[PDB]
């Protein structure tokens, strides 16, 4: 749920840039956003996927241990 929301909020920023594409692209007063919007977008994507990826690794480590340790105790 958290990864899906943060992905939808990131997609919301992409709409905000598309809805205002002509201004972010042609008006030089907004050049810094045009230049650094994707850097911030990647850093946001990285945090979203990093957390999902790390959580995924831990869940798989947890699942493979309880199965192995259980058979030893049997």
């Amino acid at each position: 749920a958290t990864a899906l929301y943060k992905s939808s909020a990131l997609a919301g920023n992409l709409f905000l840039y598309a809805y205002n594409y002509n201004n972010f692209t042609a008006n030089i007063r907004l050049r810094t956003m045009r230049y650094l919007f994707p850097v911030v977008s990647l850093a946001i994507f990285g945090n979203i996927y990093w957390d999902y990826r790390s959580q995924l690794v831990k869940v798989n480590l947890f699942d493979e241990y309880i199965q192995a340790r259980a058979q030893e105790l049997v």
């Binding site: 205002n20 002509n22 201004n23 692209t25 042609a26 008006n27």
Partner: protein
């Protein structure tokens, strides 16, 4: 002699900016924000009644 006058063919069109529109104006001002604001709050809610609602 004046009635015999004619008219030259003018240019077809001037330059069309590819990044300025009436709804998405390129440059900023408080005039366009006013248009978007009064479209949000809507026009004056005119009452047809003889007494106020309250």
């Amino acid at each position: 002699k004046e009635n015999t006058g004619s008219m030259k063919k003018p240019m077809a069109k001037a330059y069309e900016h590819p990044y300025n529109s009436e709804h998405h104006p390129l440059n900023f001002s408080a005039v366009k924000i006013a248009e978007t604001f009064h479209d949000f709050i809507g026009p004056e809610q005119v009452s047809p009644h003889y007494e106020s609602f309250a």
